[PDB]
Design a binder for this molecule. Structure first.
Ligand SMILES: [Mn+2]
Ligand SMILES: [Mn+2]
Ligand SMILES: [Mn+2]
Ligand SMILES: [Mn+2]
Lengths: 139, 139
């Protein structure tokens, strides 16, 4: 059976997105529990988040057969991983975040539009720094 | 301007999913670099990943006004956060992972099917442990 083109490929991508968001959400919830003084709850959110890291990385390992879910490019070696990170980052800073900022401004959300513009600049920095590292890579 | 129902709400959800995945992907890439001996590259993936945590958590802060992107439910306090986590985990073990497992088996990916079944069981454990924590919450 060929994973490329299958429903199972799409399910792995969806589940990877879900596990990734679960870790982020659980760490955000841990920080809320921190401030409240709910240290036992915070520790449980953190421990569960480690589980979601293991799940997401297992999904990504299967996706090595088909490509990085963010870009379609192969991944595995540092050279490949940097090239994929660069392509994804370039999309975020040239297209995704500028477009989101425009939509937010048009809809009346000036603070959110400025946030998206801050993130476009931040992803441009990430893209350039990864490109510098790729040029310096000796493998 | 009301965030609920807007294109900006959908963009925050999409950007939250993207930043979450970027952190997970960059830490996976860092582990690849670790094994290769590319320690400077690994450190860069880790530092960039901290940036993506800050971005994702900023997106989530805006989404507090409309609901948890995984469940649609309120979030903020530990009680709310545990409630939303339990609902999401319950969806994962009663619906999402079992259905992904069946599709994998039907398509001939027996190992991936077994992986989805392991995760269904793990998410059920997560749900039940969060429920025990909510039962004990004093707030
Ligand atoms: Mn999980
Ligand atoms: Mn970035
Ligand atoms: Mn980012
Ligand atoms: Mn879980």
């Amino acid at each position: 059976a060929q994973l490329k083109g299958s429903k199972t490929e799409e399910n792995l991508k969806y589940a990877f997105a879900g596990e990734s968001q679960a870790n982020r959400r659980y760490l955000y919830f841990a920080s809320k529990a921190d401030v409240e003084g709910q240290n036992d709850i915070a520790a449980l959110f953190r421990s569960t988040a480690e589980g979601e890291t293991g799940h997401a990385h297992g999904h990504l390992e299967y996706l090595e057969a088909v490509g990085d879910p963010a870009t379609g490019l192969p991944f595995g070696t540092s050279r490949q991983n940097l090239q994929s990170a660069i392509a994804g980052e370039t999309h975020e800073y040239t297209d995704m975040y500028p477009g989101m900022a425009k939509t937010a401004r048009d809809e009346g959300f000036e603070e959110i539009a400025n946030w998206f513009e801050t993130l476009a600049k931040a992803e441009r920095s990430h893209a350039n720094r990864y490109t510098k590292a790729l040029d310096g890579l000796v493998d």
